[PDB]
């Protein structure tokens, strides 16, 4: 069988949005507070993460349907899933070799070494890298990788979501394409779809862990003053 | 006549505090978000200013007497005068030659050129530079320069101050030393004290102007998200 135009349109809409919100040159990183190898990485990583939220937001605004949700629902979806979309989008720079994130080169090559001095512990980093490695192995296509981000972001089972039904539709019309594409365009992708959805479940645990650790950090002003207004607002607890 | 030990003690206490909170190497500037020559300077200047607040706070905590005020009064004094202390402390790097702020070298040499793309207008920059030039000419001693900062910061006529009387005492015991020192240790400083107090009055107008312009900028989230948590909190309107 084969996909339909409507479906193909969705894929081109997403893939484009990703391209438009993910700079392969990573030249924006030079504008972050310099990396430094006591939480010496917090400034640079905080900037990287804030910057990523801005990209994740830009991506969402282009997911077809998303822009028609209520401003309230849009936020609820972002606040709860932004951290997962960031973990998903960051895989495109994760390297199995050096086991790190290589972004344009040195200074922007975050080994498990430097990633420690950002306020988080192994209780997060361990599962995180484990995730990046596992995910990196599914050698997804750009099309599938971008779909998974739109699916993750359009999960109606996030706290705060009002219309936990219209979002159900959207995510469903999304999982359809993913299932289809994998069937029609991915050789040896018979057990893929199921492996991907499992990743979305792993993102839930990582989300939980990051949340706990973020709270402890964020409670200490000597540390929260190192963050950015956007990071504070998005990862904040304001209802 | 000559000063007393008590007075001399105050001067050594201040001068030391200034030395301890003002790095002549300006090596901390490398850690700011890089300067960039549309409000391209906002990131770097926001970082410079946030960093300066931290220094101004550190200075205050060492002004004798200040630490005994109520936590509430301490804040009221900082929130209202921090911007003036920064303008006063920044003079130590202002250069009459190039008419700019030279901090360790290039990238950190802010001409009236780059200082424009930070969100402020000539309605502030004009009087500001005018101030820096005028002040730079009073060729103050470190002792007098540091006293003027402690006097400015201990003004009881700032909104929010509760004990507008105990602070009156402190600032007074401060103006005493300044008047004395200028008399006993500054040749040709007969008309100085009066010129200095006039500067404290100019700082009031600059403060007013910055406040107006800060409000407009700070009202636009695309811009306020460029600031830091400390800058937002200190220049904020929270009562």
């Amino acid at each position: 069988h084969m996909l339909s135009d409507e479906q193909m349109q969705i894929i081109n809409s997403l893939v484009e949005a990703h391209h438009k919100t993910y700079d392969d040159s990573y030249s924006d990183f030079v504008r972050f507070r310099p990396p430094v190898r006591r939480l010496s990485m917090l400034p640079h990583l905080a900037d990287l993460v804030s910057y990523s939220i801005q990209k994740v937001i830009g991506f969402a605004k282009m997911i077809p349907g998303f822009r028609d949700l209520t401003a309230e629902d849009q936020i609820a979806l972002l606040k709860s899933s932004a951290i997962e979309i960031i973990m998903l989008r960051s895989n495109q720079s994760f390297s199995l070799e050096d086991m790190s994130w290589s972004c344009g080169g040195p200074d922007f090559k975050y080994c498990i070494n430097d990633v420690t001095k950002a306020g988080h512990t192994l209780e997060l980093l361990e599962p995180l890298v484990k995730f990046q490695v596992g995910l990196k192995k599914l050698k997804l296509h750009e099309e599938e990788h971008v779909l998974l981000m739109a699916i993750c972001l359009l999960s109606p089972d996030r706290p705060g979501v009002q219309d936990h039904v219209r979002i159900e539709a959207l995510q469903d019309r999304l999982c359809d394409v993913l299932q289809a594409y994998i069937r029609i365009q991915h050789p040896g992708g018979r057990l893929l779809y199921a492996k991907m959805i499992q990743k979305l479940a792993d993102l839930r645990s990582l989300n939980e862990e990051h949340s706990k650790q973020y709270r402890s950090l964020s409670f200490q002003p000597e540390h929260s003053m190192q963050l950015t207004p956007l990071v504070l607002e998005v990862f904040g607890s304001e209802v | 006549h000559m000063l007393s030990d008590e007075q001399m003690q105050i001067i050594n206490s201040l001068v030391e505090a200034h030395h301890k909170t003002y790095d002549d190497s300006y090596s901390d500037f490398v850690r700011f978000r890089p300067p960039v020559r549309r409000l391209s300077m906002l990131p770097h200047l926001a970082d410079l200013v946030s960093y300066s607040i931290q220094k101004v706070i550190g200075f205050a905590k060492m002004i004798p007497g200040f630490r005994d005020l109520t936590a509430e009064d301490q804040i009221a004094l900082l929130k209202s005068s921090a911007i003036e202390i920064i303008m006063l402390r920044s003079n130590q790097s202002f250069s009459l030659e190039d008419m700019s702020w030279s901090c360790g070298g290039p990238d950190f040499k802010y001409c009236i050129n780059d200082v424009t793309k930070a969100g402020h207008t000539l309605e502030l920059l004009e009087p500001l530079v005018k101030f820096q030039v005028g002040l730079k000419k009073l060729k103050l001693h470190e002792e007098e320069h540091v006293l003027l900062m402690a006097i400015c910061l201990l003004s009881p006529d700032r909104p929010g101050v509760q004990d507008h009387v105990r602070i009156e005492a402190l600032q007074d015991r401060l103006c005493d030393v300044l008047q004395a020192y200028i008399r006993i240790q500054h040749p040709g400083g007969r008309l100085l004290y009066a010129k200095m107090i006039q500067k404290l009055a100019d700082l009031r107008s600059l403060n007013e102007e910055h406040s107006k312009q800060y409000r407009s900028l700070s009202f636009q989230p695309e811009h306020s998200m460029q600031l830091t948590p400390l800058v937002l909190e200190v220049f904020g309107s929270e009562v």
């Binding site: 801005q54 937001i57 605004k61 401003a71 849009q74 936020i75 972002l78 606040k79 207004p229 956007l230 607002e233 998005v234 304001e238 209802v239 | 636009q220 989230p221 695309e222 306020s224 998200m225």
Partner: peptide, 10 residues
Amino acid sequence: RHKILHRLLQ
């Protein structure tokens, strides 16, 4: 309540 998120979302 979510000043920056709003401005960014339009």
